[PDB]
C-alpha cells in the first residue's frame, strides 16, 4: 500500500513458522528486548497485536554474517584516537570489547573531552569508562533503529510506545494523487525511496532522447539507447494505485543512479506519505474530543487527501454437465437502463460507471430443471414469456463499492492460454473510484497520534490567523501531555519555521545558539525543506532561535510569536480567542482503514451448513457475532425476551425466521420463538456419541 510497506516486508525478522515458536508457546522472556539487540534488531518496529515482540525488523546498518548470525559494524578507537577502519562484529564479539556512545564529543582527533564516557559493557550494563579504556565506538546515531522508524523527526523526544505506534502506521499509509514531500523529515527518506524499487532509477547515464507519460527513452553516451516502460494505474496487492509519473525534461542530461520517475508515494525521488497541513492544537467544541480530528472541506475540494483504489473482480467460465458458460448478453429477464453500459461481447464498455448490484459480466448458464412452480406456468400465458432455460449466473457488483471501469483482461481456451483444467474462459475486470476524504477515515501523523475524522466542516467555521489563512487541521490538546508524544509539537514548530523561512541576524556576532548550528541554516527561503536525524537533530535552543526569526510572508506580520503560539479568530462567532494557540505544519497521512471498507449491515443473508446460524465477514453477507460475554450483559439487565429473540429467531430457528419475516411484511404481531435448531443438532451429536440423552416432558 506504499513503498515503505514493501521495504519493511523484507528486512524484517519473524519468530513464527516451522521450527519456531507460536504465540501461545511464546513466554514473556521471548517478547522482551535483549540488550544484545542494540544495533542488531531495532527495538521499535513491531506489530502491536498479539504478535508483539515476536515479529521484528532489521536495523539500517545491520548485515547478515555468512553463518546466519546478525552482524553490525562499529568504529574502533585506540588511545583516544578513532580510526576510520570499520570492522564488523557479531553479537557475542561485543562482549569482549567495549562500545562507546554514538554521539560523543570528538575533538577532530578522536580524543573525548572527558575521560568517563557513556559506554555499553558486555552484560548490557551501561557505565562510565575512561577515554583511554574504550576500544570501540558506534558507527553513527540511528544505528539501533529501523528504516521505517528512522523517518520520525524528533524521535528522541517521543515515548517508546508512541514511536512504536507511529512506526506501525508508517507502513499503513496509502498513496495520494500528489504525494507532496514533507516539509520536515529525515535523511533516510531519499535512500528508502530509491531502494524501494518502485521508483525507476536510470541505471546508465546519458542525455534524455524523449519523455512521455507512457514511456521514457534515455540516450546513452555510447550509441545505444534505453527505454523504460512505465506502469500507470497498476493495481497493488492491497487495492491501491501504483501511478508512476516522470520527473525529467526533454533534453536535460541525467546521471546513472538518478531518479527518473516518482513512485506512488514519492516526489522528486524522496519519500512522501502524506501532506503538510496547518495545525491548531486547541480543542474545538468537542468535535475533536478524545482523539477525534476535524478537517477543512478545502481538502475535499482541493483533492488534498484523496486516493485511487483499484479493485479486481474475477469470473470463471468452466465446464459442466450443462454444457458450457457463454459470455454473452442473452441474460433472462433484464431491463435496458441497466444493460446500456454493457457491450455486445458480454462485458462492460471501457469507461462505464457502475454501482452496487449492477450487472458486470454476463455468464449465461443452463438452468437445468427443478420444480417449476405451477404459478409460473399460469404466468407465461399472460405476457407470452419464453421458458428462459438458462440461469443468469452473471457478475453482480457487491455492496459498498462503485466507480469507473479501467480495462478488461480476458483469457480463453480459444485464445490458447494455459487455463486450468475444465476452465474455458477467465475474465478479470478492474473497477476504480476516487475515494475522497470523509468522516470516519483514520488519519495519523508520524508521532503516533491517530484518530478518525470527527467532522468535515466548511472553511468559514475554522480558526484563522491575522493573515486570514484558514487553519487546515485541528488536534486536541489533551492527547499531547497524557501520551508522552511531545515530539509532535516540536515537529509542528519546525514545520512552521520551514514554511515561513528565517534569516538569523548574524551581524553583531553569531548568536550563541547558532554557533553550534551549522552553516547555510541561518538563511532559508519560504516553503524550504529541512532534515533532522532521529537522534542527532535540532536542539531546543536551535528551535527557539528559529522561532525568534520568523520573517513574514508578503506583508509585515509575525503571526507566530517567540514562544510559539499564535493569535486566532473564531470563524463562527468572530471574536478573537482570549488566548493564543500554537500553529504550525505537521505531516498527516491517510491510513488504509477507510470507513468505506469497514461499514457493514445485514438484514437476512445466508446460513451455514451444520448450524443454521449466519456466516461471518464482509465477503459474505456476514452478520455480527453475539458472544457469550454480551449475553452476560443481556442477563444483567434482565431483558429476558430480547436475549430469547436474539438467540432463537434472529440466529437459529428456521421456522421462526420465516415466520418473523412474514410478520414484519404483513404488519402482523411477531409470534413466539420456537426451539433452536443448534440445540437439536447438539442433542443429535450427544445421541450419536453413544450418550443416551432424552428430554423429559414431566
Amino acid at each position: 500500500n506504499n513503498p515503505l510497506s514493501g521495504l519493511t516486508h523484507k528486512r524484517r525478522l519473524s519468530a513464527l513458522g516451522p521450527g519456531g515458536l507460536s504465540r501461545e508457546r511464546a513466554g514473556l522472556e521471548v517478547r522482551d528486548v535483549h540488550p544484545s539487540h542494540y544495533g542488531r534488531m531495532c527495538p521499535i518496529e513491531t506489530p502491536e497485536g498479539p504478535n508483539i515482540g515476536l515479529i521484528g525488523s532489521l536495523s539500517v546498518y545491520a548485515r547478515v554474517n555468512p553463518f546466519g548470525f546478525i552482524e553490525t559494524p562499529y568504529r574502533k578507537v585506540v588511545d583516544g584516537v578513532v580510526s576510520d577502519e570499520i570492522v564488523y562484529l557479531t553479537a557475542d564479539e561485543e562482549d569482549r570489547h567495549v562500545v562507546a556512545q554514538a554521539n560523543s564529543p570528538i575533538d577532530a582527533d578522536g580524543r573525548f573531552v572527558e575521560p568517563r564516557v557513556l559506554v555499553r559493557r558486555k552484560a548490557g550494563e551501561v557505565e562510565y569508562v575512561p577515554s583511554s579504556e574504550v576500544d570501540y565506538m558506534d558507527v553513527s546515531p540511528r544505528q539501533m533503529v529501523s528504516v521505517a522508524t528512522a523517518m520520525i523527526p524528533f524521535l528522541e523526544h517521543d515515548d517508546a510506545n508512541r514511536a512504536l505506534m507511529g512506526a506501525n502506521m508508517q507502513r499503513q499509509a496509502v498513496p495520494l494523487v500528489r504525494s507532496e514531500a514533507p516539509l520536515v523529515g529525515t535523511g533516510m527518506e531519499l535512500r528508502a525511496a530509491i531502494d524501494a524499487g518502485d521508483v525507476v532509477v536510470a541505471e546508465e547515464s546519458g542525455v534524455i532522447e524523449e519523455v512521455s507519460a507512457d514511456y521514457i527513452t534515455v540516450m546513452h553516451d555510447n550509441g545505444t539507447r534505453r527505454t523504460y516502460r512505465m506502469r500507470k494505474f497498476a493495481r497493488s496487492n492491497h487495492g491501491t494505485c501504483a501511478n508512476q509519473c516522470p520527473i525529467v525534461d526533454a533534453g536535460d542530461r541525467v546521471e546513472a543512479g538518478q531518479v527518473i520517475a516518482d513512485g506512488p508515494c514519492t516526489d522528486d525521488g524522496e519519500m512522501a506519505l502524506g501532506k503538510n497541513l496547518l495545525v491548531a492544537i486547541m480543542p474545538w467544541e468537542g468535535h475533536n474530543y478524545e482523539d477525534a480530528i476535524i478537517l477543512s472541506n478545502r481538502l475535499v475540494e482541493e483533492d488534498v487527501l484523496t486516493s485511487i483504489h483499484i479493485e479486481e473482480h474475477e469470473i470463471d467460465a468452466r465446464d459442466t454437465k450443462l454444457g458450457a458458460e457463454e459470455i454473452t448478453r442473452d441474460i433472462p429477464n433484464i431491463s435496458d437502463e441497466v444493460l446500456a453500459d454493457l457491450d455486445e461481447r458480454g462485458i462492460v464498455r471501457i469507461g462505464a460507471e457502475v454501482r452496487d448490484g449492477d450487472i458486470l459480466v454476463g455468464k449465461v448458464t443452463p438452468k437445468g430443471e427443478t420444480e417449476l412452480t405451477p404459478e409460473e406456468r399460469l404466468l407465461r400465458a399472460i405476457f407470452g414469456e419464453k421458458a428462459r432455460e438458462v440461469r443468469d449466473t452473471s457478475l453482480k457488483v457487491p455492496h459498498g463499492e462503485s466507480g469507473k471501469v479501467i480495462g478488461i483482461r480476458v483469457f480463453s481456451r480459444e485464445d490458447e492460454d494455459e487455463l486450468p483444467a475444465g476452465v474455458n474462459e477467465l475474465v478479470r475486470v478492474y473497477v476504480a473510484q476516487k475515494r475522497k476524504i470523509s468522516d470516519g477515515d483514520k488519519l495519523a501523523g508520524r508521532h503516533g497520534n491517530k484518530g478518525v475524522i470527527g467532522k468535515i466542516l466548511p472553511v468559514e467555521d475554522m480558526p484563522f490567523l491575522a493573515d486570514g489563512t484558514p487553519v487546515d487541521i485541528i488536534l486536541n490538546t489533551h492527547g499531547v501531555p497524557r501520551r508522552m508524544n511531545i515530539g509532535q509539537i516540536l515537529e509542528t514548530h519546525l514545520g512552521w519555521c520551514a514554511h515561513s523561512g528565517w534569516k538569523v541576524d548574524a551581524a553583531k556576532g553569531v548568536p550563541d545558539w547558532a554557533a553550534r548550528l551549522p552553516d547555510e541554516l541561518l538563511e532559508a527561503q519560504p516553503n524550504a525543506i529541512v532534515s533532522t536525524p532521529v537522534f542527532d537533530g535540532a536542539q531546543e535552543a536551535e528551535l527557539q532561535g528559529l522561532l525568534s526569526c520568523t520573517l513574514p510572508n508578503r506583508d509585515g506580520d509575525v503571526l507566530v510569536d517567540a514562544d510559539g503560539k499564535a493569535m486566532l479568530f473564531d470563524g463562527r462567532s468572530g471574536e478573537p480567542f482570549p488566548y493564543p494557540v500554537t500553529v504550525g505544519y505537521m505531516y498527516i497521512m491517510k491510513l488504509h482503514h477507510l470507513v468505506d471498507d469497514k461499514i457493514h449491515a445485514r438484514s437476512t443473508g445466508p446460513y451455514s451448513m451444520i448450524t443454521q446460524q449466519p456466516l461471518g465477514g464482509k465477503a459474505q453477507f456476514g452478520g455480527q457475532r453475539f458472544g457469550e460475554m454480551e449475553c452476560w450483559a443481556m442477563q444483567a439487565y434482565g431483558a429476558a425476551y430480547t436475549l430469547q429473540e436474539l438467540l432463537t429467531i434472529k440466529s437459529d430457528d428456521t421456522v421462526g425466521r420465516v415466520k418473523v419475516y412474514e410478520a414484519i411484511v404483513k404488519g402482523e404481531n411477531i409470534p413466539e420463538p420456537g426451539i433452536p435448531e443448534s440445540f437439536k443438532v447438539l442433542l443429535k451429536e450427544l445421541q450419536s456419541l453413544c450418550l443416551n440423552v432424552e428430554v423429559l416432558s414431566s
Partner: peptide, 21 residues
C-alpha cells in the same frame, strides 16, 4: 546528498557519518 538527483535537504546533523547505509 551524494546522490545525483538528490534535492537539497539541509540538515541539523552535528557529525558526519563514516559510511552510508
Amino acid at each position: 546528498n551524494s546522490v545525483p538527483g538528490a534535492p537539497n535537504r539541509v540538515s541539523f546533523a552535528k557529525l558526519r557519518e563514516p559510511l552510508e547505509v
